[PDB]
Symmetry: C4
Subunit: 81 residues, 4 copies
């Protein structure tokens, strides 16, 4: 049964080896998908675009202030009629 012990040893090694293979197959599979996850996340970061968008809306507002000034100037003139 000395050979028996050897076959049982080789079978144990093979299985353990396959286990290590499944563990390595997974960890890199999940890590890769995780790298694609973080990347897709970066895409959803529209911080700069929004801040720019607000500053243009602000220029807009400052242009309506201007329009009002001109508006009330016409008002004065037609009032001094």
């Amino acid at each position: 049964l000395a050979e028996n012990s050897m076959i049982e040893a080789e079978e144990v090694r093979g299985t353990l080896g396959d286990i290590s293979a499944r563990i390595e197959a997974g960890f890199e599979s999940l890590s890769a998908l995780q790298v694609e996850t973080i990347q897709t996340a970066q895409r959803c970061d529209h911080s700069d675009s929004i801040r720019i968008l607000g500053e243009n809306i602000k220029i807009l507002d400052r242009s309506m202030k201007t329009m009002m000034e001109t508006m009330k100037l016409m008002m004065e003139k037609v009032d001094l009629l």
Copy 2:
């Protein structure tokens, strides 16, 4: 003696349970990872934000038109 065979049978069972848990865990985590990337894709609104700005720009151009119109009425 053959107490080794029964011992080997037990070792096979436990190791098989291990492999099952490994495959189950990785299979579950991966399915939730595909759900994560897909949900993130939804959070991308680059097109929407851009159309919004282009609308603000058109609106600004319309402001300039009124401004010219106003001064025009002034000259009158």
Copy 3:
């Protein structure tokens, strides 16, 4: 010595399964928190409602233009 060694291997293999379950259980907990956090970054409704307001703004501009 075969059984005592078998008892030793069983302990280590049992510890192995525990670490596997711990790792998988922890990572999933952080992914459910991750997916939930990702869901928060969806602003489709807000972005669109904002645009509809700008459309009213333009509509009012066109109204002013005709008034003049």
Copy 4:
């Protein structure tokens, strides 16, 4: 007898390699997962979006003021 001990000794060595690979992978994936959640937090722009909308609403409110002012000139131009 001895050949059994070395066989057992190998199992200890190999299983230790197994535990190490397990710990390395889990530690690595989690660290990259915490990087994921933090990056996701960056993508939340609710506050900015909200202030953005409130400014456009003020913009509309000011337009209504202009409409009222513009009519005033029409009432006075209507004098004639």
